[PDB]
Amino acid sequence: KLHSQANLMRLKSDLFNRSYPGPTKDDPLTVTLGFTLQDIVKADSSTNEVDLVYYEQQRWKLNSLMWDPNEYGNITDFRTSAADIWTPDITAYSSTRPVQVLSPQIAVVTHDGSVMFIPAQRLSFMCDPTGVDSEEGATCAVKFGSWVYSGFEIDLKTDTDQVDLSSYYASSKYEILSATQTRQVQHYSCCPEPYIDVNLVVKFRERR
Amino acid sequence: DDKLHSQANLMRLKSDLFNRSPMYPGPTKDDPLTVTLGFTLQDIVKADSSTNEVDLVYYEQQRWKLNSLMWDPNEYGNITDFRTSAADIWTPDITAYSSTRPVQVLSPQIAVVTHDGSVMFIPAQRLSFMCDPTGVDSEEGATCAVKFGSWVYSGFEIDLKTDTDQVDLSSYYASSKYEILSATQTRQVQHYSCCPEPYIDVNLVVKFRERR
Amino acid sequence: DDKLHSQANLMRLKSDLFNRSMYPGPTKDDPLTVTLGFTLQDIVKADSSTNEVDLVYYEQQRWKLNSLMWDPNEYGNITDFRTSAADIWTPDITAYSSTRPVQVLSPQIAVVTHDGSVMFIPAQRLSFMCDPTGVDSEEGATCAVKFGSWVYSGFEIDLKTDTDQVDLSSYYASSKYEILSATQTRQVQHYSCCPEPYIDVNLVVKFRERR
Amino acid sequence: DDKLHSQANLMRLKSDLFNRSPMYPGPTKDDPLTVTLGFTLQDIVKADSSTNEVDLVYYEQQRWKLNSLMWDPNEYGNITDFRTSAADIWTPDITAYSSTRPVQVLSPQIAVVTHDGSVMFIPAQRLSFMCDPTGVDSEEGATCAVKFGSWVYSGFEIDLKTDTDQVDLSSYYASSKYEILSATQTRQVQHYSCCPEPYIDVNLVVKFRERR
Amino acid sequence: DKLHSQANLMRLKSDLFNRSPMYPGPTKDDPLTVTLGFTLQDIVKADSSTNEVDLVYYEQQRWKLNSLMWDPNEYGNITDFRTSAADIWTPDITAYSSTRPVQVLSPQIAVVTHDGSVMFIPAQRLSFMCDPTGVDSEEGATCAVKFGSWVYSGFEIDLKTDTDQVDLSSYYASSKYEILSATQTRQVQHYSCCPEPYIDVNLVVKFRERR
Numbered sequence A: 001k002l003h004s005q006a007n008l009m010r011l012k013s014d015l016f017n018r019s020y021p022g023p024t025k026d027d028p029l030t031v032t033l034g035f036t037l038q039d040i041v042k043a044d045s046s047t048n049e050v051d052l053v054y055y056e057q058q059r060w061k062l063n064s065l066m067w068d069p070n071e072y073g074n075i076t077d078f079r080t081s082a083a084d085i086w087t088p089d090i091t092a093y094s095s096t097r098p099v100q101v102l103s104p105q106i107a108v109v110t111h112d113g114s115v116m117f118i119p120a121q122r123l124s125f126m127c128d129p130t131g132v133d134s135e136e137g138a139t140c141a142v143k144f145g146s147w148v149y150s151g152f153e154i155d156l157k158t159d160t161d162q163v164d165l166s167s168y169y170a171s172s173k174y175e176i177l178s179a180t181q182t183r184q185v186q187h188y189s190c191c192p193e194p195y196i197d198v199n200l201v202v203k204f205r206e207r208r
Numbered sequence B, D: 001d002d003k004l005h006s007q008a009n010l011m012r013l014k015s016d017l018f019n020r021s022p023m024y025p026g027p028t029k030d031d032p033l034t035v036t037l038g039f040t041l042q043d044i045v046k047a048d049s050s051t052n053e054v055d056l057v058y059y060e061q062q063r064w065k066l067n068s069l070m071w072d073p074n075e076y077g078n079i080t081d082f083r084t085s086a087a088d089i090w091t092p093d094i095t096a097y098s099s100t101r102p103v104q105v106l107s108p109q110i111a112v113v114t115h116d117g118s119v120m121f122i123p124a125q126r127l128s129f130m131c132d133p134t135g136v137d138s139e140e141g142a143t144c145a146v147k148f149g150s151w152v153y154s155g156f157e158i159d160l161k162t163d164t165d166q167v168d169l170s171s172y173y174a175s176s177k178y179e180i181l182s183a184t185q186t187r188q189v190q191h192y193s194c195c196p197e198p199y200i201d202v203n204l205v206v207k208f209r210e211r212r
Numbered sequence C: 001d002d003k004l005h006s007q008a009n010l011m012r013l014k015s016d017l018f019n020r021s022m023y024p025g026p027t028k029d030d031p032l033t034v035t036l037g038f039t040l041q042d043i044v045k046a047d048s049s050t051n052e053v054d055l056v057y058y059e060q061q062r063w064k065l066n067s068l069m070w071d072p073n074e075y076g077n078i079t080d081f082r083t084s085a086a087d088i089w090t091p092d093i094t095a096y097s098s099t100r101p102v103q104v105l106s107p108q109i110a111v112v113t114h115d116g117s118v119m120f121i122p123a124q125r126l127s128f129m130c131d132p133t134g135v136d137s138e139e140g141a142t143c144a145v146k147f148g149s150w151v152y153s154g155f156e157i158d159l160k161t162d163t164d165q166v167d168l169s170s171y172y173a174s175s176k177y178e179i180l181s182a183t184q185t186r187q188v189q190h191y192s193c194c195p196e197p198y199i200d201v202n203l204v205v206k207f208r209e210r211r
Numbered sequence E: 001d002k003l004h005s006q007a008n009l010m011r012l013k014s015d016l017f018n019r020s021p022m023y024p025g026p027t028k029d030d031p032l033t034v035t036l037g038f039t040l041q042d043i044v045k046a047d048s049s050t051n052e053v054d055l056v057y058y059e060q061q062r063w064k065l066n067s068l069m070w071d072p073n074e075y076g077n078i079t080d081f082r083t084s085a086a087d088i089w090t091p092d093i094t095a096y097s098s099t100r101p102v103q104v105l106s107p108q109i110a111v112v113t114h115d116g117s118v119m120f121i122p123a124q125r126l127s128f129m130c131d132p133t134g135v136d137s138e139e140g141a142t143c144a145v146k147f148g149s150w151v152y153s154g155f156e157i158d159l160k161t162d163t164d165q166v167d168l169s170s171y172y173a174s175s176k177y178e179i180l181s182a183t184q185t186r187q188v189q190h191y192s193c194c195p196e197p198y199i200d201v202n203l204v205v206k207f208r209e210r211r
């Protein structure tokens, strides 16, 4: 038991403290994103901002984070501070305030080199809630992707194209009629290369 | 005089603890840990019916114990405990599951360690969480619930326990806008899409209502 | 040119005091007394839909440490210095009923004297639990908030006051609120959770809309 | 395999640039620098007529080129550019001259450095600035303006250029409370009382009105 | 060439900051005069439900340290450079009646000149204690706020102004409020804590609604 601690000490150390500069064209990366929507907190129709609370599942895999669990006392994974590893700069493209982080910044690293990171967020973004008081509700959309890596450096994937609604707050002012998450491709004025985003479409209405 | 000596003893202990074998990497399946959580509810500051957020101020008592923090008192001039900045040691990642704003810390981040390896930490906090206050202006009032638990450690790494099911109300602000009808704290199990492993929370349930 | 010396004398004084030895805060074996006093500058806002009131004040904090003494003759005849608060231990004095983190309004800089005595006067803005009922009347409203160490009991940190009158002499003469009285009282209690004494200084303020 | 080689190649280059001859100390009259700026306006979020403040969301393409940042790709695995944290390199101190709050940064602080030593950095921001929204509720709309430029570097040390004088509006939020009649960005010169030497800014003028 | 100018700048910066480490601030034996001049950009809001007013302004700060002198000849004819304000000591100039932490609007970069003189001009937003009554009248309202070192007596930091007129030449022409006048005047203050006097510059602004 004092042994196992020492094994993990040794592996963090081997991993971090002696031997990654982000993805490149030669060494591209695939980040998988899934959203879990917890609450539409507020719809401000005097500014067309909507605040959402959700979490965002991120998963990716680095060869430099691999190890053999036999060399390390059968450790298959460990938890770690997100600052000790590279994380992807997944950004919402139409936010109107800096994202508020609601969960501790810790990730999970597995022996095959995959990393899982699940930050919870409050986000204000651009959305006209006209018709939220109608049957068909209002429809808002926000794109998420790397701000600086093109699609030849960071690819994006979803496991499914439904947002996760299974922990949506049942007593929220808004109900969700539908929530999808879909990969897309864009070009930006700066650059030849296309950029990848995952677009959250959310349809919602005042609970009544 | 012996003042200088007890000062040296404490610095020596601290450095024996921290700068030898060091910083403990958190709990694992092989080395699990039980955190005892307890809440002291001070005030429901605000209940916003247009967003269904409620704002609470409370102290969250966290208690755990690590082998790596044991020492013998007679070896350090009979020091039985000490205060230390929370940045100095490992602390658990206890998170409200339905917050809507980051938590605002109202007390200094200092814990107490005791020779037997236990640690105490009582952050005071202000939390906004998801809560529909319908009914708060009635006799029955309203009821809300928010879970607390590690965000990244399953039940096999961090288990949670309470000392009692009853929220401490003996410091509840007597002139709050809202009075407290009941407030309990009960351990639960949850599952999350990412993982087969069970996650543990303490669910805080508060029934409250406008003061007359 | 005496001015390069004075300056080296001071830097040397810093080294010798900071990285030599080293202070871990107070203990049962080596307790400390902190003198506090409040200077109330303004009641800024009284919100009666949430029962919070915002104060602006600064707090005089004084204490004395042996680890902090020096002979001035060995250091240029330097008798005192200004130093960043991050460089020295400071007491963890907290309000016990805040509703928002305190916002800090003055430099975190303290003054250290050769006898080990330290002086520090943080100016702060505080929201705390307070029902302003009756500010709009002649008797006014009463509020209270205690301050004390959050983690040290009276066996490690003792508080004293010089007066039980809050200093109102720089109170803002055009506040939305007049002060009718403002007192600060040392209190000792036991919380039978635990057998050792606890000390706080209870700020009691009486106030009404300015007329 | 070569994936590990290309990784090592980058590690090497970054090291080679970033510790020697390290932190290049900014532009000087002997060694001035040109920054090209272009704005992409996304949204007018709020126009407050009780305080005369307007809140914009935009991003700002910034480009410049340093000698100290050149390299031969052939000497580095044919690496022709790389992403890097904005803190590891000098970046220009372009500020809004009439903001009323600190700018909130919306995008990560990361830049792209090419082998000829050109750098590109595109921070997205939320700005409150001095603007009388009078007229916004009419056909004619309101006109506002905000100068951007170095705070401390005169036009002998930093020049500004634009590629076009038209703000890019192809990402303007289509259902904003405000529509854009026109948005231009124009290089200007200015003096301040501190200093004899003129300074450069790029003036963002926007004409806009409530959508109907 | 430009390789040499950079070489030289880098050498010089290394010499001041390293080579003779970090300057302990001013003392009774090494005192310091800071010149201050305000430029008022905008009165943004005047809140009469709390008597707070928000100003946007910049504050010109000059002082001179002997330990910042160099001979431009040893150093490639570099007469000045810009530098991050964290690489150097700066004065802790603080508003005495602020009700919020000051928000900084400009980058924190100073200019250092070879005679050892430093210019630093931070832009800020400030909320301070001010009763805006009369603002809608012809006479307008009048508010004042004091600025100066929070911890250094006049024997360590003295202040002076170049003129008693606040610079209005950049006042925002479409502000909710016009300025009828604006002065800055050096004063000498005594606090309870201290025998020694503290110096401050008093900002008196008289203002009203635009019409």
Ligand SMILES: O=[N+]([O-])/N=C1\NCCN1Cc1ccc(Cl)nc1
Pocket (backbone or CB within 6 Å): A146, A147, A148, A188, A189, A190, A191, D040, D061, D110, D111, D112, D120, D121, D122
């Ligand atoms: O021209 N662009 O707008 N580019 C752009 N907009 C949003 C993200 N993005 C790509 C980008 C590319 C390079 C850098 Cl330094 N930043 C951003």
Ligand SMILES: O=[N+]([O-])/N=C1\NCCN1Cc1ccc(Cl)nc1
Pocket (backbone or CB within 6 Å): A036, A055, A057, A106, A107, A108, A116, A117, A118, B150, B151, B152, B153, B192, B193, B194, B195, B199
């Ligand atoms: O899919 N999940 O929501 N997982 C999850 N939600 C709250 C806590 N939790 C488990 C978890 C597991 C691993 C990481 Cl890296 N983050 C979070």
Ligand SMILES: O=[N+]([O-])/N=C1\NCCN1Cc1ccc(Cl)nc1
Pocket (backbone or CB within 6 Å): D150, D151, D152, D153, D192, D193, D194, D195, E039, E058, E109, E110, E111, E119, E120, E121
């Ligand atoms: O006299 N000034 O107002 N100068 C000035 N105002 C805005 C930008 N600027 C130039 C300047 C020059 C030097 C320093 Cl340290 N700061 C600012």
Ligand SMILES: O=[N+]([O-])/N=C1\NCCN1Cc1ccc(Cl)nc1
Pocket (backbone or CB within 6 Å): C039, C060, C109, C110, C111, C119, C120, C121, E149, E150, E151, E152, E191, E192, E193, E194, E198
């Ligand atoms: O007794 N005082 O209020 N002193 C005081 N108030 C505002 C500034 N000032 C001087 C001072 C002197 C020393 C320390 Cl540590 N802080 C402040």
